[PDB]
Amino acid sequence: STRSVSSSSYRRMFGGPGTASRPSSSRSYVTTSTRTYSLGSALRPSTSRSL
Amino acid sequence: MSTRSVSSSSYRRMFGGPGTASRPSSSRSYVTTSTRTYSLGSALRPSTSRSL
């Protein structure tokens, strides 16, 4: 009676490099809508008092 | 005879000469040229110099 070759997937489906999509999203670059600030210092002249 | 009259002459006898009829009208109002410490507009130069 033939001891037939029991032929399950010992050939492939393995394995080790199952480490596919590592999260490169761990590098994000978040920044706010970075302001240049306003200043009234060029709207304000010197009102000189002549005597 | 003719009267040698060294008169008060008929141009100043009745006419108060040098004299109050020559009228020293000198009311001595002193012409006080009032000196103010002010150049025109010197009180306000509105200084918009705020060079920020």
CA distance B31 to chain A (A): 26
**Chain B residues touching residue A38 (CB < 8 angstroms):** none
Round to whole Å and give the CA distance between A44 and B51. Answer: 6
**Experimental determination approach used:** cryo-EM
Q: Which two tokens stand for residue B38?
A: 């002010």
Question: What values do phi and psi take at B46, rounded to 5?
Answer: -65, 105
Resolution in A: 7.2
**Chain A residues touching residue B39 (CB < 8 angstroms):** 50-51
Round to whole Å and give the CA distance between B10 and A41. Answer: 90
Round to whole Å and give the CA distance between A47 and B43. Answer: 11
CB distance B39 to A49 below 8 Å: no
Round to whole Å and give the CA distance between B10 and A29. Answer: 124
**Chain B residues touching residue A45 (CB < 8 angstroms):** 46-50
What burial letters (b/e) apply to B26-49, b meaning 16+ CB within 10 Å? eeeeeeeeeeeeeeeeeeeeeeee
**What's chain B's length in residues?**
52
CB distance A44 to B49 below 8 Å: yes
Q: Is residue B48 within a helix (H) or strand (E), and if so which, with residue range?
A: strand B47-50
In a 3-state reduction of DSSP, which class is residue A47?
Answer: strand
